[PDB]
Design a protein around this ligand. Structure first.
Ligand SMILES: CCN(c1ccccc1)S(=O)(=O)c1ccc(NC(=O)[C@@](C)(O)C(F)(F)F)c(C)c1
Ligand SMILES: CCN(c1ccccc1)S(=O)(=O)c1ccc(NC(=O)[C@@](C)(O)C(F)(F)F)c(C)c1
Lengths: 353, 353
């Protein structure tokens, strides 16, 4: 009966952002164990501390409370090891199992939270301020989750060429082809027609050396797969009375600090006003969250994911990643007096008419 | 000695947004005279009322006060006519001259305000919060000015095919070629080399009917010219040891509600982190404001102007305009309790680490 106490304790610390290189220079799981014992609790606490401070209207929903209880359990699940001592080749395996169990306990957090979004929509309505607060909270909540899962996957995978989930020689174009192949398969099964792929690389400094980077391939895959699914759906549906089916074109450009991936489709495009709503959790909920969450994966390592189409023609989706492992530093949301006032939105009659 | 009184009076009214169609359905300058007598004062007052409420540090600078005094004079310049009666074919020409004089009195507002930005930079420094407030204020101030100048140009031009500054049959591609030709001329004189132009139209609903729209051609020209100047400079400089000089490609797409213009160059591109700073008034000041202000012209009629490049390859600049004159409604900034708290930025340690 001390959960509120632990949260208040660890909620005083700030999560420690790690860089893609520090992750790579990994080497004693003892070193990791002692680190994760304090970091995971700090991260769980910060996200939990922010949740506890949102409207009781949102707190009281089975959804929020359900996951809120998962975190509480996960926090307690790791406490056990605070007084434990490594050296004991079984004290640290008790941990690896403890993590693999925590990870699975949280596997359905996205759908579960999405359910609360739908509950909110029908219970209180879908207005800008509601959208804003949810957007603000879900972006942070989810990003936070991504960072926690990263640490866990790094530990579990490392202590069962690649260092955990990180590929130091990630061939971007290869991940591009993979996500395409998978989307194509689905596209063919549902529409029995699918556009082709064209890839072009632009290695600025080294004209034809294949483009490689240090990155988490499964994160990149998730982003590309989501974008390919949308570009295919739109290309196919917008040419349902055309016989020609333009291909989806991808350019992978590597500059001094940016590694950019552009995906261009001729799927008809979308009006500027609807684009703004494609990344909204609330407006994109019914009666998925591929886009808003894919973006969080981009931002997690200081990158981004942006969209811009031409209604009547097509859409460009660009994923911006940092080219250097040095610049790829975890982007973590933290609980401060700063994050507190973003929930004090009392909007009613704006500054523009 | 009543300037403060007038401002407080008219500052109680909200400016009245007009649509591109109402501007087109114009027809008695008497009707205009009586309208502008109240609207101009209301608009001058709202922008003046917001200025008076910014740090005295900014208020006391010769720049701000200098323009602040221009508005005061312009406000008083129009008061005269409040009790005047039309019918008198000379009572309303006293007005047209009164406007043509007010317009010229304000011709150098941009450079003058820019001077205050530089003053600020060296006097107090260039930090995020300073940038934010200036950005917030200058965007509104300038937009406000654009709307005032619009009314004035509409009146003066109408009462000396086109209705004032509005072309009901604006051929976009033609304005594209014009701004290109002019930028090319300058580009040739300075670099003695200039890229070519390729234009492609995508009239979704009508495959090959030339793309026309109702718009203010000189506004569109200003935006395109700025973009062409940047795309030329970058293309030329990035290929200074190449002999090939890729062309600048423009696509004009017309959809059900959007009329989009994309300008693609292969000028090397810019790192994502510097893009964010290209639209900043503060960071783009030394020791011009083409971009940030071009964007305001786009937004003025509910459109937008966005940038996205690929470091190491090139940049796409897109101008989004509303396709329907019905949707082209003046976007006006207004003074409310809402606009007040955007200047209460007390940032110090954010929500992210
Ligand atoms: C934060 C401490 N670091 C630091 C930072 C700045 C200066 C000096 C030192 S560190 O580079 O020594 C470091 C890096 C990765 C991990 N851990 C891992 O790689 C994993 C796999 O255990 C996990 F899960 F944490 F990601 C651990 C335990 C420590
Ligand atoms: C705002 C009033 N309008 C309205 C709106 C909604 C419902 C009913 C009526 S209106 O359409 O009658 C109208 C439109 C343009 C102008 N003026 C002009 O076109 C100009 C040239 O005088 C100027 F400068 F104002 F732009 C004027 C005086 C009035």
């Amino acid at each position: 009966g001390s959960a509120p106490k632990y949260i208040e304790h660890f909620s005083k610390f700030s999560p420690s952002p790690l860089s893609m290189k520090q992750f790579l220079d990994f080497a004693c799981e003892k070193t990791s164990f002692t680190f994760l014992r304090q970091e995971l609790p700090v991260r769980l606490a910060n996200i939990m501390k922010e949740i506890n401070l949102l409207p009781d209207r949102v707190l009281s929903t089975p959804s929020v409370q359900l996951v809120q209880s998962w975190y509480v359990q996960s926090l307690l699940d790791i406490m056990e090891f605070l007084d434990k001592d490594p050296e004991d080749h079984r004290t640290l395996s008790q941990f690896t199992d403890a993590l693999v169990t925590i990870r699975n306990r949280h596997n359905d957090v996205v759908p579960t939270m999405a359910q609360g979004v739908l509950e909110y929509k029908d219970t209180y309505g879908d207005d800008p301020v509601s959208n804003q607060n949810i957007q603000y909270f879900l972006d942070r909540f989810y990003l936070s989750r991504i960072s926690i899962r990263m640490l866990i996957n790094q530990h579990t995978l490392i202590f069962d060429k690649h260092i955990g989930s990180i590929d130091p020689n990630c061939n971007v174009s290869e991940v591009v082809k993979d996500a395409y192949d998978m989307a194509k398969l689905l596209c063919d099964k549902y529409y029995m027609a699918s556009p082709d792929l064209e890839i072009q690389e632009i290695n600025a400094a080294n004209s034809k050396q294949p483009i490689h980077m240090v990155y988490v391939p499964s994160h990149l895959y998730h982003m590309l797969f989501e974008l390919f699914k949308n570009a295919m759906r739109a290309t196919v549906e917008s040419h349902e009375s055309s016989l020609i089916l333009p291909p989806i074109k991808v350019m992978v450009a590597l500059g001094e600090e940016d590694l950019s991936i552009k995906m261009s489709d001729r799927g008809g495009g979308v009006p500027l006003r609807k684009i703004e709503r494609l990344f909204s959790y609330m407006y994109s909920t019914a009666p998925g969250y591929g886009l808003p969450i894919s973006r969080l994966y981009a931002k997690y390592f200081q990158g981004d994911l942006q969209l811009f189409s031409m209604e009547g023609f097509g859409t460009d989706a660009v994923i911006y990643l940092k080219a250097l492992s040095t610049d790829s530093v975890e982007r973590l949301p933290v609980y401060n007096k700063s994050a507190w006032r973003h929930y004090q939105t009392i909007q009613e009659a704006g500054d523009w008419c």
